[PDB]
Symmetry: D2
Subunit: 249 residues, 4 copies
């Protein structure tokens, strides 16, 4: 058919933090376009819920990214059940905001490990298969903070800017072999949180966003799905900013 | 389908990028007006667009010619939903050899045309509270290129334009973005020598030249309803030639 | 001092940044030729430069005046070692109300001026394998700003020009760089309501408006021998209003 | 534009960039504490600083060592007015061969160090409502480099960190900045193949490797009272290797 290349069938997609919000939006979108999605979560309850909504189109698994041992059996589980990972989506970002003078060492370490080093560990683990296949996608869910900096979020900003630098390097290494490594940088996105924010709080967030709204989880998903698709094979080492104009370039 | 009931103006749609954009939109359900400098240009456009659209003669540097094409489109189709600025030429030279008119032509055709055509479509977009303005820039504007300072000013300047404009119209559901292609295989690049081509390909980690559809796919995404939260942004499609 | 024996050409040197640049360069041992739009401006410019330089009337849009000015500089002083391009103007308006003329004037004065003046001083710089071209841009060209789509097209455009030019002449000991002021205190800003100056200060983490001298110090640094490994770069001096 | 009465702490001051930073501030009136990871390197720093400062041993990945140095410095000198983070190392490998600790050591030596040292001198700079933080980055953090993904992630992270700390302390008259060297001639550099050196020079329009003093000047300018309106900015010193 015309648009035959547009399908994701035959492709295996690994999405981290797929329990809610963006991550769930990504997994659902990829499945809707024909891919088998494996979503991962931090707890065993998180994994089961993911398996629930993926149903027959994929699998939930509990992956504790920080533990290198956790990665190995999760990838092996996928290889045995589905196969090698065609598409890696790194979406396991947390936040531990504080100003610098009040910032605890653990809050710095846990942000660096969960948001920055998680990317390196997972990218490495899926790297080799995509190089044999000569086709691959790595997309990391970044943040406008990494570009702009935000007071009280120096750890976040450091992690989110680091994964851009990490991606550009990886891109240069694997570009020649049909692998793509990009970042999607969201602005304020509406979540399970935000709905309980106060009118004053919600106003102050909106003042920052020229578009005058918060973005949708799906808006991030559709960026990710385009970049993970066969018509984005010429984009690597790039950051696709989805923030309603809160920042530019 | 995806652009059900949307009217798109693609300037410079005779070939390459422009033709690939027009057809991608038509293939996804838009009425498409594609533009050319010449009669046969416009005629041949209308030929390949057939029932899904129409080719018109447009001179992006002439205010009167803009006035007629848009007034022409309004009469028969309606108001423009999606504007793609893909006019743009080169006149390369080192600075020390660049003629004043080689500068001015590149400025008029590749930068000031972006101002004229966007202003002309925006009133209606502001009123409708929805829209898309998309401009085809170039890696050159971000990276700079010896022998192309006029191109680099124009392609850089269309980004600064887009940003400001994107701030003026963000609140009313209009996005304004730039797709910045790297080296895209064209007639002229197939005409290069073996040694020149090697020099091009050496700059591109991906190891190939890009295809026009690759730009077309990027533009259709940004013009779609799923790209609504992206404004004032530059989507680089250069195979790794340059990064961020 | 740092600039002994060097000849500097500072365009728009009547007041503000232009004057502060001219004064700093004199302080540090340079013979400076400042320009102004009027013969009266040149009067004042010569008045404050004294035996360290001279004022001249220069119309950056007119090739005829560009040549005349350069002949007189070569006659009375020698070959321009340092070109500082600071002949910017403003014509703010929203896109819907921007006149064709407000666009063109900004593009001519603020962008195309950098092309003509850089081109005119460049040959001598390459003959001596040493030189400095520094253009005064604006944060607006990087972040964009509603009502300043013409100014931002230009301020961004001159960065694309500088990146290309830098690549053409790096091999020959010349640097081409841009200094980007955020909000700088001028007589125009001093004249603003308390509400307006509050709104500006909210945008600037440093709590203040920058000073003309602060821009000059960045220019003086880039023009020095301590910046000879810096080319193609933008130096943002905006108290944190925008970052990178 | 002296640094009289100022106390500057340059981590990684044994040789090269850090020793030129250290020496240059001394020459402009600063008392300087230079650091190294071994007590011998700390000895050699004391020797060349002599009367104008002192060397000390600092393990930037250890909070204990950080406190020991800083309380020492408060004793003999006072509070740190100026902080230069020049304590990068590399641990190069393509991603498939990069081991966990090779990733971890570079993140902790080149990025978390910036966090730990910056917090460590921040409070005193906040009470005095004046300060300077400058981190030595790398063009690699901006453009990315194959086989350097850990180095680039860190060198980029420290720009993101610097941007938000700048926002936190800008209103109290402290700037936080990055200098991003390109290829800088070192002892390790002069000792490579002609083939290697030629391949480094291939990437630099300036035609040459940068010097350690050139980076020191950028740092010296940024730490001066003339750079008070620059914060959250990266200043790229790379011969045009990369642009903006």
């Amino acid at each position: 058919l015309y648009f035959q290349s547009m399908s994701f069938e035959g492709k295996i997609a690994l999405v981290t933090g797929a329990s809610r919000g963006i991550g769930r939006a990504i997994a659902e979108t990829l499945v809707a376009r024909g891919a088998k999605v494996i979503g991962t979560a931090t707890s065993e309850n998180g994994a089961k819920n993911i398996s629930d909504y993926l149903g027959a189109n994929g699998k939930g698994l509990m992956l504790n990214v920080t533990d290198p041992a956790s990665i190995e059996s999760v990838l092996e589980n996928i290889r045995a059940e589905f196969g090698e990972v065609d598409i890696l989506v790194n979406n396991a970002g947390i936040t531990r905001d504080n100003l610098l003078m009040r910032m605890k060492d653990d809050e710095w370490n846990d942000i660096i490990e969960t948001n920055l080093s998680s990317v390196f560990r997972l990218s490495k683990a899926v790297m080799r298969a995509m190089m044999k296949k000569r086709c691959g996608r790595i997309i990391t869910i970044g943040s406008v903070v990494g570009t702009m900096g935000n007071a009280g979020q120096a750890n976040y900003a450091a992690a989110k800017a680091g994964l851009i630098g990490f991606s550009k390097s990886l891109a240069r290494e694997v570009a020649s072999r049909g692998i793509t490594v990009n970042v999607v940088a969201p602005g304020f996105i509406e979540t399970d949180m935000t709905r309980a924010l106060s009118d004053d709080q919600r106003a102050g967030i909106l003042a920052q966003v020229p578009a005058g709204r918060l973005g949708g989880a799906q808006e991030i998903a559709s960026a990710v799905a385009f970049l993970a698709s066969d018509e984005a094979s010429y984009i690597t080492g790039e950051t696709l900013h989805v923030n309603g104009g809160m920042y530019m370039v």
